[PDB]
Design a protein around this nucleic acid. Structure first.
Ligand SMILES: [Mg+2]
Ligand SMILES: [Mg+2]
Ligand SMILES: [Mg+2]
Ligand SMILES: [Mg+2]
Ligand SMILES: [Mg+2]
Ligand SMILES: [Mg+2]
Ligand SMILES: [Mg+2]
Ligand SMILES: [Mg+2]
Ligand SMILES: [Mg+2]
Ligand SMILES: [Mg+2]
Ligand SMILES: [Mg+2]
Ligand SMILES: [Mg+2]
Ligand SMILES: [Mg+2]
Ligand SMILES: [Mg+2]
Ligand SMILES: [Mg+2]
Ligand SMILES: [Mg+2]
Ligand SMILES: [Mg+2]
Ligand SMILES: [Mg+2]
Ligand SMILES: [Mg+2]
Ligand SMILES: [Mg+2]
Ligand SMILES: [Mg+2]
Ligand SMILES: [Mg+2]
Ligand SMILES: [Mg+2]
Ligand SMILES: [Mg+2]
Ligand SMILES: [Mg+2]
Ligand SMILES: [Mg+2]
Ligand SMILES: [Mg+2]
Ligand SMILES: [Mg+2]
Ligand SMILES: [Mg+2]
Ligand SMILES: [Mg+2]
Ligand SMILES: [Mg+2]
Ligand SMILES: [Mg+2]
Ligand SMILES: [Mg+2]
Ligand SMILES: [Mg+2]
Ligand SMILES: [Mg+2]
Ligand SMILES: [Mg+2]
Ligand SMILES: [Mg+2]
Ligand SMILES: [Mg+2]
Ligand SMILES: [Mg+2]
Ligand SMILES: [Mg+2]
Ligand SMILES: [Mg+2]
Ligand SMILES: [Mg+2]
Ligand SMILES: [Mg+2]
Ligand SMILES: [Mg+2]
Ligand SMILES: [Mg+2]
Ligand SMILES: [Mg+2]
Ligand SMILES: [Mg+2]
Ligand SMILES: [Mg+2]
Ligand SMILES: [Mg+2]
Ligand SMILES: [Mg+2]
Ligand SMILES: [Mg+2]
Ligand SMILES: [Mg+2]
Ligand SMILES: [Mg+2]
Ligand SMILES: [Mg+2]
Ligand SMILES: [Mg+2]
Ligand SMILES: [Mg+2]
Ligand SMILES: [Mg+2]
Ligand SMILES: [Mg+2]
Ligand SMILES: [Mg+2]
Ligand SMILES: [Mg+2]
Ligand SMILES: [Mg+2]
Ligand SMILES: [Mg+2]
Ligand SMILES: [Mg+2]
Ligand SMILES: [Mg+2]
Ligand SMILES: [Mg+2]
Ligand SMILES: [Mg+2]
Ligand SMILES: [Mg+2]
Ligand SMILES: [Mg+2]
Ligand SMILES: [Mg+2]
Ligand SMILES: [Mg+2]
Ligand SMILES: [Mg+2]
Ligand SMILES: [Mg+2]
Ligand SMILES: [Mg+2]
Ligand SMILES: [Mg+2]
Ligand SMILES: [Mg+2]
Ligand SMILES: [Mg+2]
Ligand SMILES: [Mg+2]
Ligand SMILES: [Mg+2]
Ligand SMILES: [Mg+2]
Ligand SMILES: [Mg+2]
Ligand SMILES: [Mg+2]
Ligand SMILES: [Mg+2]
Ligand SMILES: [Mg+2]
Ligand SMILES: [Mg+2]
Ligand SMILES: [Mg+2]
Ligand SMILES: [Mg+2]
Ligand SMILES: [Mg+2]
Ligand SMILES: [Mg+2]
Ligand SMILES: [Mg+2]
Ligand SMILES: [Mg+2]
Ligand SMILES: [Mg+2]
Ligand SMILES: [Mg+2]
Ligand SMILES: [Mg+2]
Ligand SMILES: [Mg+2]
Ligand SMILES: [Mg+2]
Ligand SMILES: [Mg+2]
Ligand SMILES: [Mg+2]
Ligand SMILES: [Mg+2]
Ligand SMILES: [Mg+2]
Ligand SMILES: [Mg+2]
Ligand SMILES: [Mg+2]
Ligand SMILES: [Mg+2]
Ligand SMILES: [Mg+2]
Ligand SMILES: [Mg+2]
Ligand SMILES: [Mg+2]
Ligand SMILES: [Mg+2]
Ligand SMILES: [Mg+2]
Ligand SMILES: [Mg+2]
Ligand SMILES: [Mg+2]
Ligand SMILES: [Mg+2]
Ligand SMILES: [Mg+2]
Ligand SMILES: [Mg+2]
Ligand SMILES: [Mg+2]
Ligand SMILES: [Mg+2]
Ligand SMILES: [Mg+2]
Ligand SMILES: [Mg+2]
Ligand SMILES: [Mg+2]
Ligand SMILES: [Mg+2]
Ligand SMILES: [Mg+2]
Ligand SMILES: [Mg+2]
Ligand SMILES: [Mg+2]
Ligand SMILES: [Mg+2]
Ligand SMILES: [Mg+2]
Ligand SMILES: [Mg+2]
Ligand SMILES: [Mg+2]
Ligand SMILES: [Mg+2]
Ligand SMILES: [Mg+2]
Ligand SMILES: [Mg+2]
Ligand SMILES: [Mg+2]
Ligand SMILES: [Mg+2]
Ligand SMILES: [Mg+2]
Ligand SMILES: [Mg+2]
Ligand SMILES: [Mg+2]
Ligand SMILES: [Mg+2]
Ligand SMILES: [Mg+2]
Ligand SMILES: [Mg+2]
Ligand SMILES: [Mg+2]
Ligand SMILES: [Mg+2]
Ligand SMILES: [Mg+2]
Ligand SMILES: [Mg+2]
Ligand SMILES: [Mg+2]
Ligand SMILES: [Mg+2]
Ligand SMILES: [Mg+2]
Ligand SMILES: [Mg+2]
Ligand SMILES: [Mg+2]
Ligand SMILES: [Mg+2]
Ligand SMILES: [Mg+2]
Lengths: 97, 76, 63, 44
RNA sequence: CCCCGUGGAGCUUUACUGCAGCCUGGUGUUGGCUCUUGGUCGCGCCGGCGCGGCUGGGGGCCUAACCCUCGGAUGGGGGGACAGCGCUUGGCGGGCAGUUUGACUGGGGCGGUCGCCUCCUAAAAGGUAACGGAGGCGCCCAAAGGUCCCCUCAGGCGGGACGGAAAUCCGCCGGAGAGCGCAAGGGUAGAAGGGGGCCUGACUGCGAGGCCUGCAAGCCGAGCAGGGGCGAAAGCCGGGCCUAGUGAACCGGUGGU
RNA sequence: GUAAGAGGAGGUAUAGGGAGCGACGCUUGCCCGGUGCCGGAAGGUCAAGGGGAGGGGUGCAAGCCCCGAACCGAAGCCCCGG
RNA sequence: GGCGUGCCUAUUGAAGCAUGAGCCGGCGACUCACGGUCGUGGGCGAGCUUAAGCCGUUGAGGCGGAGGCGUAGGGAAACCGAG
RNA sequence: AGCCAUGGGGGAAUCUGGGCGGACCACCGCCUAAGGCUAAGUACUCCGGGUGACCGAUAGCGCACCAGUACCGUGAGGGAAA
RNA sequence: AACCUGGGGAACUGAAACAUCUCAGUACCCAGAGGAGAGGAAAGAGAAAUCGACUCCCUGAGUAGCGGCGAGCGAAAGGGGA
């Protein structure tokens, strides 16, 4: 009946705009721990065919886990993620065009 | 008439007591003026709020002329 | 059918990865004029709520 | 009167309160910006 | 009847907000000739004269749009680029329409009050009601702030040119009955009070841990890093002895990354 | 009545609408500050629109586009009087 | 002979001079759809699951991964990522 | 605040044409307004049939029965029992 | 009977008052179509040097966004189908 707890305030900037959302590339965080699970040649094709991509626009391996030896084609690598695979594998970056 | 008036209670006075274990910074006692003085390992703020500076036990020490002091004896 | 997310509360409250609800500190935009540097700084950060935290959860549910 | 101090050769403000008629027209008190450290702050 | 419900309806107006209606500028329907003032482009002539398109305005005449009318007239008469009508401007606008018109309250109305601080009520923790008793706040200050050093009252009695209940000065007694910007209270001279010297920590980036608390909010804060002030230094400074001096969110203003 | 139109009236200020008072007799005083209505070619304010000093965006450029001062702009309200 | 103030409702309080009910029979009030949250029975597991629809059947199922939830968070965002 | 549509005013060009890609400008790309027609997949159920962890005469349609009837109302309309 | 298309178009109610807003282009009045009706071969979509009429279902998605940024309201591209 009083001022709802709506007394809190919208910091959220970019909260909207007439034409709406901007089409920008979406990077899916995929950990190299689950990546090391299977072995061969990991590419976006495989991770989406069965795993943790789900048609997400881009792939970006990263984080905890221990890197198996293999070529890992991704669209982006974490600085720390580039270390694990460099220490026993190849760093195949993304496309470009 | 013209009376019904009063500022809400401030809930001051002795917050911690002698023989109580205290962390670092716990307000030991909130007060109006200097009803209590600082002491060993005990600072105070703008409102005369007394609060621990170390970890330990509270103790009160009356000293007639000087007044009433409160300190914390460190230990671990 | 299909609860609608309360937009007004999404536009001002993010739910944490665990289950907590965070939001910005109140009273920092208007009342201001000259308040201790402590105040305006204390007001910069975000906090957690309590019981109504569960209330607000029940809106951004599909979210 | 609500006062606001500016920084020299820069763009920084600060909370203040000047006096209208009371003996106080300008404000030449020093202060500390974020860029570098310590520079005089005029009223403006 | 009476009260209550964020019920209804009829009615009122200088309640709010529309609407019809009426007034009004531009423009379309909308045309001709002429006189007069301002402008405008080119030329003949020393800011002005002569010519044309375009004109803005003002006065006049015209007829063929448009309107009225006359023995059914492809016409005559009257009016006439006005009126009417379309779009658009602003204004008057209970004729009409939709609604608003707080709560507490020893029934309601009238009166009074509505948030913040101090004291009492309050029953020796905290808390605690009444249209209980009694007062304040919606500010003030670049010195009334920081720091260094220095000084200590009010009053009573005695004594002193103006003055003496009380100006100012010397003396003796004088632990706080003064002062602390302002209410009250707690506190305080072993300063928080009075006075100088240097200065602007009425800094930025933070915040261990607590008081208070239904939520939100309010409150205290050591210590850390940066750069700085006062002091030989240990050290103090993140505004004023402290408790009031205020306003969630929304919408919008100005300056920056 | 949206309109066409109709009532007014197939009437014409000795008529038609509105308002108040209310046969008839004797009478109907003072106050225009406020409100209303009436009058007032000046002046103040005022919308669209006309105007365009000056300013901005972009482009290699000619340009395109936007912002905008003075000044001309009704009724209304202010003002003046009944 | 002993004892003994109807039922319901509403209430601080009802046998109440508070409400409702002449009596009987029948009718009569917490449901469903979608989404949500907790619990619970069970299937599978870093995976789990299908929607329209197509094929079959005529009280038969199967197919269909498009898509959804989950495997990473933090920040307004750019971005970064076990931070 | 674009795109689409258009009541009012101004008012073009025919591929060196013209519209669009969220103000505007340049760049890159898209599409060709101001004429018309076009089956199927889709909606519904007065009508026929089939089926029901649908009802069984206070139910089920208002009507299992000569019911939109009797009766009611100026009328629109209301509307049983059995 | 209902379905459909166009022209016109409410209020209760919600917002715990109410005026924008909501109810809702719903109710309903009207004109027209037919076993359907509408729509329909890009002056399209919108970021892929990609798609390729129209309708219908699943999804996208309670997303994007709109909003006294209240109450609420709520797309499209794309993907799976007829
Ligand atoms: Mg309120
Ligand atoms: Mg009281
Ligand atoms: Mg009190
Ligand atoms: Mg301090
Ligand atoms: Mg202090
Ligand atoms: Mg955690
Ligand atoms: Mg702002
Ligand atoms: Mg202010
Ligand atoms: Mg400060
Ligand atoms: Mg900051
Ligand atoms: Mg989702
Ligand atoms: Mg109420
Ligand atoms: Mg009501
Ligand atoms: Mg009412
Ligand atoms: Mg009402
Ligand atoms: Mg009415
Ligand atoms: Mg008025
Ligand atoms: Mg109207
Ligand atoms: Mg009109
Ligand atoms: Mg006009
Ligand atoms: Mg007009
Ligand atoms: Mg004209
Ligand atoms: Mg003239
Ligand atoms: Mg002329
Ligand atoms: Mg003249
Ligand atoms: Mg001239
Ligand atoms: Mg000239
Ligand atoms: Mg001349
Ligand atoms: Mg001449
Ligand atoms: Mg001329
Ligand atoms: Mg004439
Ligand atoms: Mg004529
Ligand atoms: Mg004539
Ligand atoms: Mg004339
Ligand atoms: Mg005219
Ligand atoms: Mg018009
Ligand atoms: Mg108007
Ligand atoms: Mg209404
Ligand atoms: Mg209403
Ligand atoms: Mg009341
Ligand atoms: Mg009374
Ligand atoms: Mg009153
Ligand atoms: Mg007192
Ligand atoms: Mg007490
Ligand atoms: Mg007490
Ligand atoms: Mg007690
Ligand atoms: Mg109590
Ligand atoms: Mg009393
Ligand atoms: Mg001084
Ligand atoms: Mg002072
Ligand atoms: Mg002073
Ligand atoms: Mg004396
Ligand atoms: Mg004396
Ligand atoms: Mg003397
Ligand atoms: Mg003298
Ligand atoms: Mg004192
Ligand atoms: Mg001090
Ligand atoms: Mg002194
Ligand atoms: Mg002083
Ligand atoms: Mg000093
Ligand atoms: Mg804390
Ligand atoms: Mg709290
Ligand atoms: Mg304070
Ligand atoms: Mg240095
Ligand atoms: Mg301090
Ligand atoms: Mg103070
Ligand atoms: Mg001081
Ligand atoms: Mg206090
Ligand atoms: Mg609001
Ligand atoms: Mg009309
Ligand atoms: Mg007539
Ligand atoms: Mg007649
Ligand atoms: Mg007559
Ligand atoms: Mg008359
Ligand atoms: Mg009269
Ligand atoms: Mg009389
Ligand atoms: Mg006489
Ligand atoms: Mg008279
Ligand atoms: Mg008279
Ligand atoms: Mg007289
Ligand atoms: Mg008058
Ligand atoms: Mg007047
Ligand atoms: Mg004038
Ligand atoms: Mg203009
Ligand atoms: Mg112009
Ligand atoms: Mg220029
Ligand atoms: Mg110019
Ligand atoms: Mg340029
Ligand atoms: Mg000027
Ligand atoms: Mg005028
Ligand atoms: Mg006058
Ligand atoms: Mg017996
Ligand atoms: Mg009870
Ligand atoms: Mg009885
Ligand atoms: Mg009774
Ligand atoms: Mg009763
Ligand atoms: Mg009952
Ligand atoms: Mg009875
Ligand atoms: Mg009965
Ligand atoms: Mg669903
Ligand atoms: Mg459910
Ligand atoms: Mg829960
Ligand atoms: Mg479950
Ligand atoms: Mg089990
Ligand atoms: Mg579905
Ligand atoms: Mg087959
Ligand atoms: Mg089949
Ligand atoms: Mg069979
Ligand atoms: Mg997640
Ligand atoms: Mg870590
Ligand atoms: Mg047009
Ligand atoms: Mg041509
Ligand atoms: Mg040609
Ligand atoms: Mg040609
Ligand atoms: Mg060509
Ligand atoms: Mg050509
Ligand atoms: Mg664009
Ligand atoms: Mg190219
Ligand atoms: Mg296109
Ligand atoms: Mg064509
Ligand atoms: Mg078909
Ligand atoms: Mg049938
Ligand atoms: Mg029977
Ligand atoms: Mg029977
Ligand atoms: Mg039959
Ligand atoms: Mg028969
Ligand atoms: Mg009957
Ligand atoms: Mg009858
Ligand atoms: Mg009936
Ligand atoms: Mg309404
Ligand atoms: Mg509301
Ligand atoms: Mg009402
Ligand atoms: Mg609508
Ligand atoms: Mg319509
Ligand atoms: Mg068909
Ligand atoms: Mg067809
Ligand atoms: Mg067709
Ligand atoms: Mg068509
Ligand atoms: Mg067609
Ligand atoms: Mg389409
Ligand atoms: Mg369908
Ligand atoms: Mg769904
Ligand atoms: Mg919207
Ligand atoms: Mg809407
Ligand atoms: Mg709608
Ligand atoms: Mg699709
Ligand atoms: Mg498709």
């Amino acid at each position: 009946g009083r001022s709802t707890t709506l007394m809190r305030l919208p910091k959220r900037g970019m909260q909207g705009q007439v034409p709406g959302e901007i089409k920008r590339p979406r990077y899916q965080g995929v950990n190299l721990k689950d990546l090391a699970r299977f072995e061969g040649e990991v590419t976006p094709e495989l991770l989406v065919r069965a795993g943790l991509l789900k048609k997400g626009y881009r792939l970006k391996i990263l984080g905890e886990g221990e890197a198996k030896p293999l070529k890992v084609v991704a669209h982006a690598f974490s600085k720390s993620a580039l270390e694990k695979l460099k220490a026993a594998g190849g760093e195949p970056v993304l496309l470009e065009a | 008439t013209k009376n019904g008036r009063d500022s809400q209670a401030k809930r001051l006075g002795v917050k911690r007591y002698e023989g109580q274990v205290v962390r670092a910074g716990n307000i030991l006692v909130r007060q109006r003026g200097t009803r209590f003085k600082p002491g060993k390992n005990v600072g105070m703020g703008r409102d005369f709020t007394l609060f621990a500076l170390v970890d330990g036990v509270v103790e009160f020490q009356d000293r007639g002329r000087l007044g009433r002091y409160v300190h914390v004896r460190p230990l671990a | 059918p299909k609860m609608k997310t309360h937009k007004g509360a999404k536009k001002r409250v993010k739910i944490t990865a665990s289950g907590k609800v965070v939001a910005m500190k109140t009273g920092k935009r208007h009342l201001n004029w000259q308040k201790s540097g402590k105040e305006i700084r204390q007001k910069g950060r975000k906090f957690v709520l309590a019981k109504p935290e569960a209330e607000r959860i029940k809106l951004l549910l599909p979210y | 009167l609500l006062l606001e101090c500016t920084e020299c050769k820069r763009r920084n403000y600060a909370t203040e309160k000047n006096k209208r008629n009371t003996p106080n027209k300008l404000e030449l008190r020093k202060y500390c910006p974020w860029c570098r450290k310590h520079t005089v702050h005029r009223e403006v």
